[PDB]
Amino acid sequence: MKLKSFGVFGNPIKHSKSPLIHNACFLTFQKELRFLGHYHPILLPLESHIKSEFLHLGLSGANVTLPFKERAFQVCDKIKGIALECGAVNTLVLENDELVGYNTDALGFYLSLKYQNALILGAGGSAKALACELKKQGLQVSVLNRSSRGLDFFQRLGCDCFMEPPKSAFDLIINATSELPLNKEVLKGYFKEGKLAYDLAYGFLTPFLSLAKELKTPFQDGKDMLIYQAALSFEKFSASQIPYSKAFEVMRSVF
Numbered sequence: 001m002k003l004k005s006f007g008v009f010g011n012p013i014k015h016s017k018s019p020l021i022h023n024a025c026f027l028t029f030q031k032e033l034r035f036l037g038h039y040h041p042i043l044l045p046l047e048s049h050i051k052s053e054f055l056h057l058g059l060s061g062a063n064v065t066l067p068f069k070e071r072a073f074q075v076c077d078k079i080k081g082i083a084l085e086c087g088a089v090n091t092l093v094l095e096n097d098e099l100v101g102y103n104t105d106a107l108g109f110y111l112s113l114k115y116q117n118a119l120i121l122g123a124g125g126s127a128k129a130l131a132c133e134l135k136k137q138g139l140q141v142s143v144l145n146r147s148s149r150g151l152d153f154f155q156r157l158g159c160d161c162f163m164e165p166p167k168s169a170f171d172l173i174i175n176a177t178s179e180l181p182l183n184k185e186v187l188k189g190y191f192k193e194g195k196l197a198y199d200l201a202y203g204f205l206t207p208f209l210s211l212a213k214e215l216k217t218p219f220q221d222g223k224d225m226l227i228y229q230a231a232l233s234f235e236k237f238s239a240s241q242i243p244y245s246k247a248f249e250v251m252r253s254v255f
């Protein structure tokens with residue numbers, strides 16, 4: 001049989017655990033796949049073009065992380081699935097010689113979650129998918145950032161958008177930014193009244209999460225969402241031949 005290349009585009013990329021869990025699946029499922037799969041971390045220059053590099057490297061599939069998720073959306077020949085509402089793409093597959101973009105953050109996030117409203121900190125690709133998913137569940141959603149970038153997107157979703165921290169209670173406080181992401185005391189009142197502090201970062205313990213832990217607020221890091229979204233991308237990487245639940249169990253064991 002034959003060799004197929006995959007990877008994860010990101011800057012930075014050193015700390016990504018996608019190659020670990022995807023390589024495990026490519027090894028485990030190789031007879032069903034009927035190819036030899038290998039998944040690399042690919043550090044992309046900021047100035048670079050996701051589509052051109054995908055093609056030049058001859059990949060069959062890829063994941064996309066910070067800060068490239070919205071750009072991935074703009075440069076795909078074709079967008080399918082919930083990605084169409086996400087304004088962001090974290091999953092790339094070569095299909096009929098066309099670069100096709102999907103989003104597995106949205107469902108991956110939903111699966112990671114064991115809530116009436118939410119506050120999202122951040123405005124990038126991850127924040128965009130989570131707001132889409134959470135509006136889709138009938139939650140009230142507020143988005144807080146320093147500038148007004150992404151206004152249009154979140155406002156058309158029907159999110160409440162803010163640059164000053166709203167004086168309100170939220171069940172979910174979500175750190176989807178790229179130091180603390182807010183004034184310590186502001187973050188403290190959010191936690192005091194919040195039900196879950198949720199941070200998309202994984203593999204290390206962020207200031208945001210230390211502070212919640214410190215204040216006895218229930219907290220969750222990005223590990224579960226990482227594995228679900230990876231599992232889901234894998235399903236797309238297999239031509240839909242290995243279901244995400246199978247991928248998911250292998251990916252959980254290795255981690």
Ligand SMILES: O=C(O)[C@@H]1C=C(O)[C@@H](O)[C@H](O)C1
Nearest residue numbers: 008016017018063064065090
């Ligand atoms: O490997 C990581 O750290 C990446 C993290 C994300 O945000 C996912 O969308 C990517 O698909 C994978």
